[PDB]
């Protein structure tokens, strides 16, 4: 009796910005699905985030390293913003080695076959001495939600980084009139998503729908 919506278009506006169109939708279902998917996408999408950093010669974040423009704490903050997609494993160790003057960016991270750097120009720090060199081991873990380091339960020098696993940055949704073959009371839902570039928009939409359906299984057979 109800017409079932289908994914009809995916407009990849940019690498981190996409639009997904669901069509057709009956009255009221556009806003219902829009809000449910918005909440699930903002709260429950999985992603890979930096959780641990080991910089050679560094004991804690409240310190400086010779030849480095940024404080160790600022380096950790920059690594917190590093967007990485990991394939086939939930935890990886990346190696960053850089020498000489210049910005040390995500492109200088040692290449890993199962790891993709979505934004290679992400600045990690700046080396300002020709003889200065930085070497770090960065732990990247898969998770969901927000997991602070203080609520996370180690040799000295292993610095914990707060993990914002969610790849989704912004979600908006608009319900507008849809042009059907014979119907006029059908809407379409356009979900505009801005991410960190580490999750496919269609994968995110299907993921949110699966989460919603599994949460609805309890109500489907109430007892």
């Amino acid at each position: 009796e109800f017409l079932k919506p289908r994914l009809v278009d995916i407009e990849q506006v940019s690498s981190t910005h996409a639009k997904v169109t669901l069509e057709p939708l009956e009255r009221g279902f556009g806003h219902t699905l829009g809000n449910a998917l918005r909440r699930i996408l903002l709260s429950s999408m999985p992603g890979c985030a930096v959780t641990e950093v080991e910089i050679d010669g560094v004991l804690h974040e409240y310190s400086t390293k010779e030849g480095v423009q940024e404080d160790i704490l600022e380096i950790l903050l920059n690594l917190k913003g590093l967007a990485v997609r990991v394939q086939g494993k939930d935890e990886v160790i990346l190696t960053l080695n850089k020498s000489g003057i210049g910005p040390v960016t995500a492109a200088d991270i040692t290449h890993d076959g199962d790891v993709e750097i979505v934004k290679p120009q992400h600045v990690i720090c700046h080396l300002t001495d020709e003889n200065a060199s930085i070497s770090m081991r960065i732990k990247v873990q898969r998770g969901r939600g927000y997991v602070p380091a203080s609520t996370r339960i180690r040799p000295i020098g292993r610095l914990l980084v707060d993990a914002c696993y969610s790849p989704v940055e912004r979600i908006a949704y608009n319900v507008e009139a849809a042009r059907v073959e014979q119907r006029t009371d059908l809407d379409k839902l356009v979900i505009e998503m801005e991410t960190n570039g580490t999750i496919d928009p269609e994968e995110a939409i299907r993921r949110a729908a699966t989460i919603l359906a599994e949460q609805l299984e309890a109500f489907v057979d109430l007892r």
Binding site: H31, G34, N35, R38, R39
Partner: protein, 50 residues
């Protein structure tokens, strides 16, 4: 002058926009003043007082 600057940024001159409830998606019935305020964390943390 503030309204002129708001026009320059293609923002409403009243400083009020349409907000939606995140819990339900329902539009709030009246325009809500939304902007940027410069906020300070005072040295009166609950950690030191509890």
């Amino acid at each position: 002058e503030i309204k002129e600057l708001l026009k320059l940024g293609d923002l409403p001159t009243s400083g009020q926009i349409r907000l939606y409830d995140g819990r339900t998606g329902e539009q709030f019935e009246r325009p809500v003043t939304v902007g940027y305020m410069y906020m300070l964390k005072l040295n009166h943390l609950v950690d030191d007082k509890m």
